[PDB]
Structure 1
Amino acid sequence: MSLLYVLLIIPIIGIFLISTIDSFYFFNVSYYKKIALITTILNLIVSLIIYILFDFSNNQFQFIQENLDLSFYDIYLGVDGVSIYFVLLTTIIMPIALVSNWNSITNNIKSYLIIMLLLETLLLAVFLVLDVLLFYIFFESILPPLFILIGLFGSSNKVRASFYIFLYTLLGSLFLLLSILTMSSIVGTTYFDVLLKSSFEYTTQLFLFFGIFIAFAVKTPVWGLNSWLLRAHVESPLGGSIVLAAIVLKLSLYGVFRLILPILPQASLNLTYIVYAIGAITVLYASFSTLRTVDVKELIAYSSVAHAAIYLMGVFSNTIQGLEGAILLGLAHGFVSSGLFICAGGILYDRTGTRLIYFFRGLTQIMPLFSLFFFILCLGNAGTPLTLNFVGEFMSLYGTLERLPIAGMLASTSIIFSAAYSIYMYNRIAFGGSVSLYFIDCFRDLTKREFFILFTLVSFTVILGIYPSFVLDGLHYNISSVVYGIEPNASYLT
């Protein structure tokens, strides 16, 4: 039983215990929440054990278990540098997501925990599978649990939201499936170790690129294909929102490393000016739009759109710096956007019952712990240094500028507007007068739970912001394998 298969098995045992413990003890709801939390903790503990044993400079997939009982659809698991940190981010985030809803579900708690635990197994399976069809099977398997999570525990407009996220993702994924099936037909197999060895013809690469890019653009999302995010990420329960923004957005980013950079390098090189136009447009249009967004979670949801454009531009830079920056920005956005949704969807929305920004003012006066963390998360969302958000933005933007300067400059302008919308929101909530006259009751400050799910998130971004080498050390050799090009005097040694 490989460590990687252990990762997928623990959350399934937790589901079993959650749904059977009543036959051994009316069981208290606190029991279910404790089973689910410990389950995610042991999954985090296993992912940390794997990371200690992980080797930073191996071109072999590590911790793979030999199957040799070949079938039509077999599940092979393996990990290298590009997948190791996405696996860690999934295992760190999900316990925080569980605590972020400890008190705010209050109904169908068994269903919420089983759905949350199942989502962990599926999302981890996405980052661990060593086959392109296996990748697709898990990328899509999460829609029905996502569809039912929003509908069971979402806000007032959760019906329109759940439909939007289901149908957008399916429609785009159906175009990715067509591209994937063409690959398996030509090659005979979708296993990574032998599909990357193959060489597709240019026009095949061109049509393979559109099919895959249409799906990755719905999931980034790119601007104009992002209606589903505006609805789903806001109407979802807080735990759903954290998982949706901090893990699910990353699948398309990790999928660019496994599905287009190795097999479609000519198409990627010849179409970067189209990816960059869409990437540049998304940086500006989203930034201007979130400046005028009045729902606090939708403002924070809309920020994810702007940052996802920056690491989408990085992965197509064909440079070592852009690709490392893209993973580091995708990781950084995972912590910071998780904290900002806890601040908005968890702290403000539980106190007031509303998310309109018009009703908030001067919260610093009564809530100095919320404002202290909120400001640090508003700095991190603005790409301020000593946050992992700056190291990722600077490396991602440097690659974008070097690959194509006109897009780099425009994507650079995000340094202004991210700051602009992040600080403007911060002032209309924490500063900007005395406590809002709409509040009749006074508000309490962060509970111990709220303090420690924020302190944990702001610790990860800051420590990684001062020493990003912890992550870059395990990306240097694997990131190198996805670069496409040669130097005049280093190529073809004899």
Structure 2
Amino acid sequence: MSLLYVLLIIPIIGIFLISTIDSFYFFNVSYYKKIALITTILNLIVSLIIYILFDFSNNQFQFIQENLDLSFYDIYLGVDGVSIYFVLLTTIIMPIALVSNWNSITNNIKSYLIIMLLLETLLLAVFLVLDVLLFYIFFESILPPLFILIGLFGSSNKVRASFYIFLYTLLGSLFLLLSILTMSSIVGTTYFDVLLKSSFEYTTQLFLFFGIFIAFAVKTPVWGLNSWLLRAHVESPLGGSIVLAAIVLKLSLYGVFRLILPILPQASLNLTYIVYAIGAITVLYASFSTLRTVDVKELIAYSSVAHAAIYLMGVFSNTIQGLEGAILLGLAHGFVSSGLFICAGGILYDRTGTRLIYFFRGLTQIMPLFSLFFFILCLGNAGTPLTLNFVGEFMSLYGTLERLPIAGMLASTSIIFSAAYSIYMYNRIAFGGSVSLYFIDCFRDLTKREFFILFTLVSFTVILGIYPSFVLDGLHYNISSVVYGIEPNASYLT
């Protein structure tokens, strides 16, 4: 069997073991948690084995298994240098997601672990499948377990929040389905190798673009459309919020390198000015309203909207630099947003039971270790050099500017306004007076669990910010096949 199926089967084996141990024993919930965490370690172990054996400049799909037994819907699993790092991020994030929420679930612990083990399978799949109809199948199988992850383990406004993400993500995904169905009917299949050969007529590509973009604007999400995220990324449990922002948000970032860039190039080129206008607006309106947010977890959720706009504008630049910067900023947001939900929804909400920023002040005086990590995370969210977030923004903004110079200049306002929301939140909670008077008793500082998941996540952000070539070497050759263009003395050689 292929080694890419081993990534899928392990979480499946782990769900089986959680449901069949109580039959060998009133077993403790501690042993439920250990099995799920070990089984996400193994996926990470395997995924690094896949990465050692990867070939950084091969234009054929790798780790493929020859099926030669065709059906109507067959799983085809290939790994490519444009998808490898999305897989690695998934497998590094899911253990922290489990450890972060280790004592906070308290009830329905089996069901909680079985959903996350299910989620890791489906999100691993969406990066590994070699069809665009297969891509859609897994891109939307994550929807039922997320409706239940929010309504069982979510906060007060959990019911409306779970309806919002499900219904918005269902609606937006059904316009992508109509366009995928058109592509398949014209071409006969949705297997990548046969689609990338095929070139659609301009008018068809103009109508496939309207349909793949409706979906991804719903799933970025852009400003006019993000009302599900400000509910779902907040009412959800801590572990739900980590997966939703780090991994689920990137399903459409990686889905533009497959669905738009190679098969609808003329449409992408001629409509970019519409994308850039939308992207510029969500860099401003989201930045303006991230200043006035009184919910700490909601402030982090709103930050993701402004970040996602920068990478969306990068993936539409037709430049090798904005394309790699978009993947780097997708990865960068993955580690940093994870840490700030760990700070907001998993530490202050553990100790105070509230998310209102009015009750917090001067937390440096009694939690110095929280303050140190909270400040480093806050500076990466502000796009400060030495973090992977700065590199992703620099390259994303450069390509946005080289393609359409006016929108990149309005996108670069982020540099100013991301810094203004990030420092203002940090100053209000850690600094900004003395330990607040609403704290009747003292609050303990970080536990050894809270320290080491923040430390792990922060370490990824810095070392990748110093040596981004750890991720750039795989991207260069594979990214070099989604650029559309020619130069006069370099093309059509004889």
Q: What range is the shorter-chain TM-score in?
A: over 0.9
1:261 is paired with a residue of what secondary structure? coil
CA distance in 2, matches of 1:3, 1:228: 36
2:49 is paired with a residue of what secondary structure? helix
CA distance in 2, matches of 1:371, 1:266: 49
1:425-468, Cα deviation, whole Å (9 max, x unpaired) = 00000000100000001000000000000000000000000000
CA distance in 1, matches of 2:54, 2:84: 8
1:239-258, Cα deviation, whole Å (9 max, x unpaired) = 00000000000000000000
Structure 2's unaligned 5+ residue stretches are: none
Match of 1:345 in 2: 345
How far is the alpha carbon of 1:194 from its aligned partner?
0.8
CA distance in 2, matches of 1:333, 1:91: 16
Match of 1:53 in 2: 53
CA distance in 2, matches of 1:453, 1:192: 37
1:81 is paired with a residue of what secondary structure? coil
Match of 2:30 in 1: 30
1:82 is paired with a residue of what secondary structure? coil
Match of 1:226 in 2: 226
CA distance in 1, matches of 2:56, 2:349: 43
CA distance in 2, matches of 1:286, 1:233: 15
1:7-56, Cα deviation, whole Å (9 max, x unpaired) = 00000000000001001121000001000000000000000000000000
1:310-354, Cα deviation, whole Å (9 max, x unpaired) = 000000000000000000000000000000000000010000000
How far is the alpha carbon of 1:299 from its aligned partner?
0.1
1:79-104, Cα deviation, whole Å (9 max, x unpaired) = 11110000000000000000010000
CA distance in 1, matches of 2:387, 2:25: 47
2:224 is paired with a residue of what secondary structure? coil
Name segments (4+ residues, structure 1) moved above 3 Å: none
1:357-379, Cα deviation, whole Å (9 max, x unpaired) = 00000000000000000000000
1:168-189, Cα deviation, whole Å (9 max, x unpaired) = 0010100000000000000000
CA distance in 2, matches of 1:108, 1:51: 35
CA distance in 1, matches of 2:304, 2:270: 27
CA distance in 2, matches of 1:404, 1:259: 22
1:379-423, Cα deviation, whole Å (9 max, x unpaired) = 000000000000000000000000001000000000000000000
How far is the alpha carbon of 1:3 from its aligned partner?
1.1
1:266-305, Cα deviation, whole Å (9 max, x unpaired) = 0000000000000000000000000000000000000000
CA distance in 1, matches of 2:414, 2:196: 35
Match of 1:183 in 2: 183
CA distance in 1, matches of 2:18, 2:214: 39
1:242 is paired with a residue of what secondary structure? helix
How far is the alpha carbon of 1:2 from its aligned partner?
1.0
Matches within 5 A, 1:252-401: 252-401=252-401
1:483 is paired with a residue of what secondary structure? coil
How far is the alpha carbon of 1:198 from its aligned partner?
0.1
1:227 is paired with a residue of what secondary structure? coil
CA distance in 2, matches of 1:242, 1:418: 20
2:189 is paired with a residue of what secondary structure? coil
CA distance in 1, matches of 2:21, 2:421: 48
CA distance in 1, matches of 2:158, 2:69: 44
CA distance in 2, matches of 1:376, 1:403: 32
CA distance in 2, matches of 1:5, 1:373: 37
CA distance in 2, matches of 1:23, 1:154: 29
CA distance in 2, matches of 1:84, 1:175: 27
How far is the alpha carbon of 1:105 from its aligned partner?
0.2
2:103 is paired with a residue of what secondary structure? coil
How far is the alpha carbon of 1:308 from its aligned partner?
0.2
Structure 1's unaligned 5+ residue stretches are: none
2:46 is paired with a residue of what secondary structure? helix
- Normalised by the length of structure 1, the TM-score is 1.00
CA distance in 2, matches of 1:448, 1:167: 39
CA distance in 1, matches of 2:211, 2:348: 41
CA distance in 2, matches of 1:99, 1:146: 19
CA distance in 2, matches of 1:25, 1:387: 48
CA distance in 1, matches of 2:29, 2:218: 38
How far is the alpha carbon of 1:108 from its aligned partner?
0.1
Residues paired across the two proteins, number: 494
1:187-210, Cα deviation, whole Å (9 max, x unpaired) = 000000111100100000000001
CA distance in 2, matches of 1:298, 1:362: 20
CA distance in 2, matches of 1:289, 1:256: 27
1:33 is paired with a residue of what secondary structure? helix
1:475 is paired with a residue of what secondary structure? helix
CA distance in 1, matches of 2:224, 2:31: 44
Match of 2:98 in 1: 98
1:126-168, Cα deviation, whole Å (9 max, x unpaired) = 0000000000000000000000100000000000000000000
CA distance in 1, matches of 2:21, 2:98: 19
Match of 2:39 in 1: 39
Match of 1:76 in 2: 76
CA distance in 2, matches of 1:414, 1:210: 28
Matches within 5 A, 1:139-178: 139-178=139-178
CA distance in 2, matches of 1:329, 1:304: 11
CA distance in 1, matches of 2:71, 2:426: 55
